[PDB]
Every structure is written in structure tokens, then in C-alpha cells.
């Protein structure tokens, strides 16, 4: 039927890992979800040492914004790059088909916008991602990436085909950032996005990220921005990585449902400890909780996650059950 | 039954990323397909800079050919190494059994040959590389592997067993090379494979490569060379890296049903965005076009894409679906 | 029912990459199944030039021992630190829930010992691995890990849900070893543990592994320690990563029945050439060997294997099968 026809709902993004509210079984026919985003160049900090980039975004976040629609819906962004800013941005969603996912019509210098449409006719999570010609892994690793999610219309289901049915979402977006270092090892410092280019291009060639981190900091999600949940609970968790293959696992926890390659017409991976969501990708994992206490989701390359960042904070509340675990004898001497 | 009453069908191969002529449902019963390589070592230009390697290569190629089968047929393979060739060479199937995969039993000196036959019992793509003792990882790094399809004898099917059916396929074998580099990060140069070893070795135990390259060279897949299709056509990608892990993803498009690793008893993943064929393994994807235009190809670590070559283009033509994906406002100022 | 009421068996484990006895089908119902390890610190020679390291064991061997109970028994670990070690260590088990895999609760100190209990609810293939706070990839990049096998109660299935036997069980670590090197490239050597720290910890952050070993050292599954079976025989071989990819092949073979990610409520995947195990996970594979004579069982990046170290061979005895593979004309010139 004619576009003009459906209903429109205008969706107002918030910050991650956090997610917009909706409904996970469609509750009103397919519909055109109109979205803004405007890009942002920042400074952001990226480490405990006060390491400082100049970071490109969606939305003033690393990652970007996790977008959710349903199976044929059509989404319409508009997207804004304000003149303050210096670069040339798009945006390639790996959900739409055609014109590089989009990226061949979105292309805008600062102080200008557009409006794209695309029908989201693949259930899964996708990574979007920026892509100007020429210079794509430079902006996709200064942050310029996220994810957008497409629910099949009746919700997710498990391995059976019976109803699975998340309680909370979080979305997780893992960034690979490539600080340019000299012969003894410093991270070097530049005036202009120009001058660091080069030095950035030799740092990517290099293939070894200076830090790899979630939401966009070494400990962003720690502390008071742990994750939370509460014993019994459902938690759907997605994950993306725009350009590295990442392996999270959740330590003390498992994947009781996982998409590792994050598309939904596909029976779900049961039981796992650790998942592989490849470099362009975005997975999800739905876990119950069944003990409360502090979790550990990481990179389970171990050095990834507790030398170069990519660990994160579940703090769980409920009732501790000894019949999983238990302290038989505590630590003592002999 | 014996070997000597069954048909034999000589084949005659061809460059990648096209593939020798075939039938997709088995139109005789089970064969001897006979194939020929001549192995040639030469130097190969492989980057924009005019950066040269001695090239080791079954029958002049970066990757060598695919060969195709059924499933049941007996594979002979006349393998010859010409006395103008310098080292010794052999070949491994992972579509064999045996014999390390016949590596052990086709040794062959410059100025002899041999023939290896073996019955292609299980169905799927697979990597052949060559495996000589105490110098395989050089071999495969410097060029000296391809693929084999062993189709089912019925053809390809879905995850519900229904046909599938290819109008075109192309095979895509991705190469990671190991140029050893001085302490200034310039790439050495060598007189004979020999003085080229050590060197050769330590590059390798980096594990960085220099390039990673689509068909033996940074945009062999592009411009005059891109691969080609038409909105509505199905086409068979066939992908394969002998020693390192890849993640294929087509900008623009899916991978409608996608064997990551390779392997056709099992039933294929649908709509990916982006897969993981890992090192030592051959995958394929089938992809129906549903858009015109330029799509690229690519290892989704773009790093390893736009700048170290993993990176070719589809061209294809058709009629524009503004259903599928529209402009809605063109980018302009505000 | 209450956990004193349930039979309890004592199991007395054996060094990888042989495995204890244990039946594949429960006899009995769900138990308490106990386990002794003893933590030794050691000096041990990974490879040919006879670098030594200071490992951390479980039980004086890397990997440590392969344990094998039944869904819904109950593991209880009493792990001992004897006052001859310096360093704090713990144990977190992927098979288990709560309490960080129960590290949290099993942190003990030079003269201290600890008892562990918690019901092993999902069946798999599970790595365990020491994890103190503040220092969880080098005790682990030290050796210190190993993996636990949950068995369904009854059996292994096929991917039709048929039953699945094997005759021969092993069990293969591997181990991703980051020793210190200085600007020349020469392995550093250190006086104490908290000497090597700082420069154990930078080794890791270049991602860059250099050694990979099975069994704890280059050629460990080699020579009179290689791996033997007979033609006919089934095989299933676990292997366990718990920090970095891999990538297992069994040159000559495959894998019939295949769990990448280990966890058998899934269906295997069949006939892979090369399947890939994620950094943080244990995966199975079974194999019924065809032909005689030596295999070698890889790391199929093979840089990683021959170069590395991340190579085994089988040693296979019977009969030579002509009709699978056979030299139609043996090396000769022209
Ligand atoms: O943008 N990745 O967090
Ligand atoms: O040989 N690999 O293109
Ligand atoms: O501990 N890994 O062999
Ligand atoms: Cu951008
Ligand atoms: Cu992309
Ligand atoms: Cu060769
Ligand atoms: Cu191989
Ligand atoms: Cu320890
Ligand atoms: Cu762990």
C-alpha cells in the first residue's frame, strides 16, 4: 500500500545502555518510526589515565543510539550535521538494502540534513554505522556507530517456537579506538581532525587497539552505571561491534538464548558461556537471573577486558540460593 | 563398485572469481572428474604502491581455481611442478581423508608430477592449499591455496529442505600477506626464496598482515574487473582464507541463507548482516539483488577492508525500488 | 532433596590430555561428585630454545585436568594452596551460577584451603580458570585454566537426536603464552613474580601471543606423546581456549559431529573442515577415524601452529582404504 497511508510515530532516542520504550509484539499494523539523530564531534575521555580524543557521534553517545522497530515497518531518520561541526557524515544501515545501506544518499557537510526512508524488511539487530567515502574505519572507529534492532511482529521466540519475553533491555555497543602512538609508546597529541589523519591511518594498520571499551570509557559501566537486575528477572542484552569481532560472556551467568550473529528467523543458540559476535555485527543474549550479587560482562579475551577496558557491572538484588552454590569450607589454613 | 567402470569428465578450469561450467543437480551418476594444475611461482604486483612478491600459485592464480563436484565423486588431481619452479610443492584437500589430506603422497620437485585420486565423501565448499613439511604457513601466505565445492548430488537447499537454486556464482578467496618490514616500517626486498625465509618467518610471527586482497591484489575486483548482477538474480559468493579469520559482508545487501562454514548437511543461516568464515575454512552465501547500483564487498573489519584491500564491488543493474529504500530529502542546507 | 542425602563419589583426576574414567550414560542418580586440586607454581620449558616461564597450575599440569560429572550433580572442589606458592589465587567455573562462577568465594592464600559446592545445571563443554581481582588475565595467560565436561544424563546425541558413543576421549588446552621481550626482540627474564608484572602486563596488551601451545609446551602432543587411535575408532577431542580464538583442524579428517561453542542441548554441526572455539569457551568435536597413519591436529591459522607451536599429531593404526584415497602416479619426472 501507498507509504502515505500508514501511521506515522515519532520515536524519541535516549542514551545508552539504556533503550526507548516499545512494544515487543507489534500492537498497531506496520508503521513509518521517524527517528532524529545529530552528529556531534566531541572530546570525550576514554580511560582512567584522562586519554582524550576527538570522538565522532550519533547523538552526543558512543555508541550511538539503539533504534527498535518491527518487521516491514519503514524507518525515516533525519539526520543532522550542525555547522559547528568539521567532517562530512552519513550513515550505512546494515537493516536496508540498497545505495551502500543508505550511505550513497545521506552524505552531509556540516550545516546540513537529510531524510532517509527504508523499509526493515530483515528481523534481527544490525549495526548502522558512518561511511564517507574514503575514509570509513576512520570515522567508525572515532565512535561513529550503533544499532538498530527489528523484532519480528510476534515478539522473539525460542528454539521451539514458544513466546521468549524480555523484562529489560540493554543495549551494549563495544568500541575499538586506535590512539596513535610514538616509538616509546605515548599517545601523541593533534590540533585538527587533518593533521591526525595520517597518524591515525597507521595506528588502524597496526590492527591493535589501544583500548577497547563499552559505552564509550574504560568503566562507564561500573559503579553507579552498573547494569541492574533482580533475581528472576529477564534481561535481553544486545551487543554490537562495528569493526572487531568481540567474544562477551557473563561471568557468574550465562547466554540461555543467544543470536550471536544477531538475526532472529534463526533458532536461537542454547545454554552458551561465551558467544562470538563478529566485527560488523550485532547479537543478543536473553539470560534469567537466578543469584544476585556483582557480575562481570566482558570481553572474554581477558586482556581485552581488564587491561584495555571492555568490562562492565551487573549489580543483581534478590535471595541467595545455596542449592546452586555454596561455601562448603571458607577460605582458611591448615 | 570399481573405479575403472565409472565415467570420467575432464575439466577444464578457470581464473576467480569465475568458476568452471557445472550442473547444481547431479545429471549422471557418480564420475571421476579429472583436473590439471601446473603450480608457477612469479612475481605479483600486489597494492597501488607497486609493491612486488615471489607469488607461489596453482595454475598462475591468487587464489587458484575452484573446483567443482558432487558429492561421491572421485577427485584427480594431475598436479605438475615445471623445472623453471625453484621450490617443492605439494597439495592438501580438507575435502579428503587421508594422508594429510594427500599432502603426503603429492610431493613433487620442479620437473615432476603425480596424480592424486580421492572421493569427495562429504558435501560443502573446502580450502586446498599447498602443505610441504616444515614450510606450510609460507606456502599458503605467499598465494598457494583455493577451494573445492562438493555440491549434494541434489543440488543446494534450505533450512526447510526445499530447492535453491544459483543463476550465477563467484568465488571470492581472500589472501592475508606477511611483506617483512625494517625497524623504519618500509617493506624488504630479497634476492632468492631462500634469503627471503627468515625474514619471511618473522613477518609471519607478527601476525599482522601487510595486506589482506580480494583475488591477488588491492582492488582486483573492482572498476573494469567488478563482479556483475541484475535486480532479481540469485547469486552464489563462495568466500575462503586458508590462514586467518574473515567476516564477509556485502554493503548494501545480506547473505539471504549462508553456510559460515561451509558445509551443506547442515542447514544455512538466514539473513546475515555479516558472517565468520574462520582461517582454514570456506564458506558460501546466496543472495538474491534487490537494488541497482554499486555494492562493495568486504572483510567487515574495515581497517582490513580500506586499508589493507579487502575490498571489491558488485555493479549491478536493474530498476530502482523506492519502497525498499528512498530519499526523502535530499541532503541540503538549513 | 536435601544434598546429605544424595550418593557422593570421589573422582581422582589424571593429567590432560588423557581424561578419568567416567561412564557417558548416568548409572546412577544425580550425585555429589568431589574433586581435589592442589595449586603448584612452577618453572616450565615451553618450547625448543628451552624458554622457561614461571607457570601457575592447577594440579602441576597446563592445561589443568579435564573434569567430567553429569547435568544436575553437584561438584564440590576442595581447592588447596600449599604455603610453597607466593600468590593469591581462586577458581571460576563457567559451569557454574553465582558468585562470579565462584570466585568470589574461593580466594585463597599461600597455606589456605577451600571447599566449593554448586550444581552443574547445564550440560556442555565449560572453561574454568583462575580469576584474583586486579589480576585475572595474567594468572590465566600463566596457565592457569582448564575445563569441565557436563555430560547430558543421557548421552550424546546426533543432530536427529539419535545416540552418539565414543570409544576414546582427549582433552586439549591451549595456551596463548605472552612472554616479555625488549626493543631487540629477546625474551626478558625476571627474579620475582611482581618484578614480571608490569612487563607481563604489557606483553598482553600487544595481542600478540609469543608462544600458543597445546598441552602446555611446543611439541607436547608429539612423538611418543602423540595421540593414537585405531581406524574405526570414535573420537571426541575437547579443546578449550579460555582467552583467545582458535581455530581446530584435523589435517586428514574433520569433524563429524561438531559443538563449536560445546553446549550439547544444541544440535552439532556436521562435517566441518575447521570450526572455531571463541576465547572463553570449550568446545567438542567427534571424529571417526577412516585411514591410517599420522595426523596433525592444528590451530588452522598456521602461522599460530607451525610457527607457534599450536600443533599435535594421531598416530592412526589399521587398514589403508584405496577407494578413499589413493596415488594414481607417485612423485616422478618427465
Ligand atoms: O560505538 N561503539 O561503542
Ligand atoms: O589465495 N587467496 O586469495
Ligand atoms: O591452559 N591451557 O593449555
Ligand atoms: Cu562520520
Ligand atoms: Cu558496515
Ligand atoms: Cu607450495
Ligand atoms: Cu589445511
Ligand atoms: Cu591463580
Ligand atoms: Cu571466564
Not at 552526543?60 to 533525519?78: A, K
Not at 550471536?260 to 558461556?273: S, V
Request: proline fraction near 7%.
Amino acid at each position: 500500500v501507498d507509504i502515505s497511508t500508514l501511521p506515522r510515530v515519532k520515536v524519541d532516542l535516549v542514551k545508552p545502555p539504556f533503550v526507548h520504550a516499545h512494544d515487543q509484539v507489534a500492537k498497531t499494523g506496520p508503521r513509518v518510526v521517524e527517528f532524529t539523530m545529530t552528529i556531534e564531534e566531541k572530546k570525550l575521555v576514554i580511560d582512567r589515565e584522562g586519554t582524550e580524543i576527538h570522538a565522532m557521534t550519533f547523538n552526543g553517545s558512543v555508541p550511538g543510539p539503539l533504534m527498535v522497530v518491527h518487521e516491514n515497518d519503514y524507518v525515516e531518520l533525519r539526520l543532522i550535521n550542525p555547522d559547528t561541526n568539521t567532517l562530512l557524515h552519513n550513515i550505512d544501515f546494515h537493516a536496508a538494502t540498497g545505495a551502500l545501506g543508505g550511505g550513497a544518499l545521506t552524505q552531509v557537510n556540516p550545516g546540513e540534513e537529510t531524510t532517509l526512508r527504508f523499509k526493515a524488511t530483515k528481523p534481527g539487530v544490525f549495526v548502522y554505522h558512518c561511511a564517507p567515502e574514503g575514509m570509513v574505519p576512520w570515522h567508525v572507529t572515532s565512535g561513529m556507530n550503533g544499532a538498530i534492532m527489528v523484532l519480528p511482529r510476534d515478539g522473539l521466540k525460542d528454539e521451539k517456537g514458544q513466546p521468549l519475553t524480555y523484562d529489560k533491555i540493554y543495549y551494549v555497543g563495544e568500541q575499538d579506538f586506535y590512539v596513535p602512538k610514538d616509538e616509546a609508546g605515548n599517545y601523541k597529541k593533534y590540533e585538527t581532525p587533518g593533521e591526525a589523519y595520517e597518524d591515525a591511518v597507521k595506528a588502524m594498520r597496526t590492527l591493535t587497539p589501544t583500548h577497547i571499551v563499552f559505552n564509550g570509557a574504560v568503566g562507564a559501566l561500573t559503579g553507579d552505571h552498573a547494569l541492574t537486575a533482580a533475581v528472576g528477572e529477564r534481561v535481553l542484552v544486545v551487543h554490537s561491534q562495528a569493526n572487531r569481532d568481540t567474544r562477551p560472556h557473563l561471568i557468574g551467568g550465562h547466554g540461555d538464548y543467544v543470536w550471536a550473529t544477531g538475526k532472529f528467523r534463526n533458532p536461537p543458540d542454547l545454554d552458551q558461556e561465551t558467544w562470538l559476535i563478529p566485527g560488523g555485527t550485532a547479537g543478543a543474549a536473553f539470560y534469567t537471573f537466578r543469584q544476585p550479587g556483582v557480575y562481570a560482562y566482558v570481553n572474554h579475551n581477558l586482556i581485552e577486558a581488564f587491561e584495555l577496558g571492555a568490562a562492565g557491572h551487573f549489580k543483581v538484588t534478590g535471595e541467595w540460593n545455596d542449592d546452586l552454590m555454596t561455601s562448603v569450607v571458607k577460605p582458611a589454613s591448615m
